[PDB]
């Protein structure tokens, strides 16, 4: 309206982990108002990836998040111009990533451009040894700051022997024009790898994602 | 069974913020299995406090948290012996607190000993200028690690002229005897300052707390 | 042997700060063994830059660092194959940067390729308001870890008026073939902007750089 | 104040991983030559179940050698004195805050220290006592918020070889207005000169000097 009850997107990423460059191409679709989507992703360059696909999986779409009527939907309101998002990921073993992303809309399909640099992963750690088994579901804490929208999450990857490998997300969401800002609130997400080929050069994903107030408010 | 539907506690804190020492005495009570409680705190030494009361309020009782029967209640199970808890608080402007606490059971009443060293608060910041107006409610991500329980929270204090002052909590919970650990889960909390005297040398608090799975699990 | 008493280098940077992309091209030269070098940089895309040049200056060459005989010069020994380096920069106001870099030798001229994503700079901060006036000289603490060379530095940019805007550097240096690693030691650096055009689309740099043991060793 | 040789006395109350302890000690040195020694006894909660090295830098930067062109903020603060505070961030999650009062009583420095260290892995170098002293270090200092601050990238040496890393952040606060320095460095080297078997008695020596950057 311009955001419709079902939209597709196209995604191009250029990325690096521990000096190893790579490029990924993909597409996706889902229900902006219900907060459900999928994506199919292809490692078009730099593959097969010598590290855990899981660290990339959350870089591939928060326009698709269900909102109640009283929490302004900053991300949907940014369109048709759209928004950019940027991120820091801090892993507990020193691994650090920054991400920068541009989200725009062309003939009613979203266009995603991602760049990703990851550094300081230990060579014997769960990322470069490929010991991660998916993300736990997560809860983001968001609020307005500095005229834009910010949010953070304590996330966790599951580990082969058991246990968790932890990572802190800090995100910034920046509309390409003035749009109404919401207050302090939460977004729940559960991202799954629904299927993949042997070496993870083709990967399909599913995310559920919904905004809400704190349950005691 | 040892933890009864209604339980009282007493609390003793010795603390320091920015070189300035203080003591606080208090008491409280509520319902361990419903996850509600209240408490009255009185500043016995080093009052009136030259910093925001808000940074101390969450150091005054997680034995009182509603658990569903499928989430092992580590803290309740630790009694009669009980548990210790420790914490890091990282404020966005450099302020850092560590906290160490002892929780025991004495004649049917909980005994709390707290010690608290906070450092690096800017002199013109919201803590030392007492510009804070209570915490948002909050959600803690917890998980087992290193034979004990740990949890983190992205918290925030409301700011006079509007805005938020952010603070990350990391907590560690240590039973004094072997007790069953839980898995990956959350805890919702809302702490309110229900009243206070003019210079915050006496303050009443109320907290609601509940353990649960992620909403999409 | 392959590293001569005087060498030139060429550098290509693709960067982004707070969603805003740019390219920079340049060439330099110095004396690898004396630890002195200059460079001239030109912004070829996304100019004039909407942020402080100073955050870019240290991404434009530690092969040019003086080394006593008793400290293995890992960077020099990596050649002719060369080495990659990577970096986290953590600014005190929440600005974060990751950098990834490739360093190779082509016809007796060093070739540098650099990518740079900076996120989460406050809109009114020293960086986006261009209020920085060069770096203090600095001392890096280095050591072998995980089969590569790592080093960290507490740096600071000078501010208009007085004062400092602080920045932690963490760096990883990865030789492209097996080379002898040094032990615990330091590197002193002083980087200067020797000249610049009106809008920092053309800028020249000088760095003096020396390795040494701690003065009391 | 400050005389060419002064004594100090120190009382520490600390906690690591929920285990409390008290320590008592005395020390002496040459405040203008930046050398000093100390002798510490664990008076309570010993033998300590964690590595002594995390405690050793909490036992005196008045004894640091200053060139004449860098204001000696800490010396100037007397007889009133200063306080100092610290955060220690260990690469494996261990965190400490430290708070300290330094005052001059009857020609002798009196030190009160409090220390809460938390979040050390049970299987890590601190709680398994696998450390072997600090590397020498270089601290970066500047004025900020009307006081003096400095930071350091420090490292404990490890049994099987290697390093256990720790960032220090210190705040030094004079009890009266005194002249602030600008941007400079402090080198230090702290040694454990002797200790009894289970570290209930320990002797340290530290050499410390302020300076500009070597290229300045």
Task: State the secondary-structure class of chain A.
Answer: mainly beta
The CATH class of chain C is identified as Mainly Beta
Choose one word for the global shape of chain A.
globular
Largest inter-chain contact set: A-C, 27 and 27 residues
Biggest sheet layout of chain C: 11 strands, mixed, barrel
Q: For the terminal residues of chain A, how far apart are their CA atoms?
A: 31 Å
What oligomeric assembly is this protein in?
A: heterotetramer
The H/E string of chain C reads EEEHEEEEEEEEE
Strand order of the largest sheet of chain A: 1-2-3-12-11-8-9-10-4-5-6
User: The CATH topology of chain C, please?
Assistant: Green Fluorescent Protein
Listing every helix as H and every strand as E from the N terminus to the C terminus, the arrangement of chain A reads EEEHEEEEEEEEE
Question: Rg of chain C, please?
Answer: 17 Å
**CATH topology label of chain A:** Green Fluorescent Protein
Number of helices of chain A: 1
The CATH architecture term of chain C is Beta Barrel
Question: What fraction, in percent, of the residue positions of chain C are helical?
Answer: under 10%
CATH-wise, what's the superfamily of chain C?
Answer: Green fluorescent protein
The CATH class designation of chain A is Mainly Beta
Q: Ends of chain C: how far apart?
A: 30 Å
Strand order of the largest sheet of chain C: 1-2-3-12-11-8-9-10-4-5-6
Q: Name the CATH homologous superfamily of chain A.
A: Green fluorescent protein
PDB class: fluorescent protein
Keywords: dsred, chromophore, fluorescent protein
Assembly: tetrameric
Entry title: A non-cytotoxic DsRed variant for whole-cell labeling
Secondary structure elements and their pairing?
The complex is a heterotetramer, with two copies of chain A (217 residues), one copy of chain C (217 residues) and one copy of chain D (216 residues).
Chain A: E1 7-17, E2 20-31, E3 36-45, H1 74-77, E4 83-91, E5 96-106, E6 109-119, E7 132-135, E8 138-145, E9 148-159, E10 164-175, E11 185-196, E12 202-212
Parallel strand pairs in A: 1-6
Antiparallel strand pairs in A: 1-2, 2-3, 3-12, 4-5, 4-10, 5-6, 7-9, 8-9, 8-11, 9-10, 11-12
Chain C: E1 7-17, E2 20-31, E3 36-45, H1 74-78, E4 83-91, E5 96-106, E6 109-119, E7 132-135, E8 138-145, E9 148-159, E10 164-175, E11 185-196, E12 202-212
Parallel strand pairs in C: 1-6
Antiparallel strand pairs in C: 1-2, 2-3, 3-12, 4-5, 4-10, 5-6, 7-9, 8-9, 8-11, 9-10, 11-12
Chain D: E1 6-16, E2 19-30, E3 35-44, H1 73-76, E4 82-90, E5 95-105, E6 108-118, E7 131-134, E8 137-144, E9 147-158, E10 163-174, E11 184-195, E12 201-211
Parallel strand pairs in D: 1-6
Antiparallel strand pairs in D: 1-2, 2-3, 3-12, 4-5, 4-10, 5-6, 7-9, 8-9, 8-11, 9-10, 11-12
PDB class: fluorescent protein
Keywords: dsred, chromophore, luminescence, photoprotein, fluorescent protein
Assembly: tetrameric
